Amino acid sequence: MGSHQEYIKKVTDELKELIQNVNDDIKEVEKNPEDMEYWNKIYRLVHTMKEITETMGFSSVAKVLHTIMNLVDKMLNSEIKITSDLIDKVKKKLDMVTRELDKKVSGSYLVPR
Fold first, then answer.
1. Alpha carbon distance 14, 9 (integer Å)
2. CB 26 within 8 A of CB 87
3. What is the DSSP string of 38-61?
4. Residue 41: CB partners within 8 Å, gap ≥ 6?
5. Long-range contacts for 10-16 (Cβ within 8 Å, ≥24 apart)?
6. What are the counts of helices (DSSP H) followed by strands (DSSP E) for the chain?
7. Could you give the 3-state DSSP secondary structure of residue 104?
8. Which of 3, 9, 55, 65 could form a disulfide with 50 if both were Cys (CB 3.0 to 4.6 A apart)?
9. Residues near 94 by Cβ (< 8 Å), separated by ≥ 6?
10. Do residues 52 and 61 make contact, with C-beta atoms less than 8 angstroms apart?
């Protein structure tokens, strides 16, 4: 393989740090739901996670991050508004990214082969 494995190693653990930063930011949104500055950060950090899993080829993982992109994009506009429980949906999906990385060693996403 004509690729640097050392790069993939870094990107894997930077993803855990990114999940930590976003879940810490979501704590401050549970405090201030209508904080568009915090949702600006979370959108752009989840964008970086999405780009990572798309460049790894994981469409199932990328789908989870792709839901957050659309979700938070709409939060920026008062037309849709930020529901308190909806912030918990963002959090729970972002929590799931770690548990979805747990499948990364297997790769058997329901298909027989």
1. 9
2. yes
3. HHHHHHHHHHHHHHHHHHHT-HHH
4. 25
5. 11/52, 12/101, 15/49, 15/52, 15/97, 15/101, 16/98
6. 4, 0
7. coil
8. 65
9. 19, 22, 23, 26, 46, 68
10. no
Alpha-helical (H) ranges within 1-113 are 5-31, 36-56, 59-75, 84-101
Domains identified in the chain and CATH numbers: 1-113 (1.20.120.160)
Dihedral of the alpha carbons of 42, 63, 13, 20, in degrees to the nearest 10 = 30
* Cα(98)–Cα(95) distance, integer angstroms: 6
* Experimental technique used to determine this entry: NMR
User: Any idea what the Cα angle at residue 93 is, between residues 88 and 108, rounded to 5°?
Assistant: 160
61/53 Cα distance (integer angstroms): 7
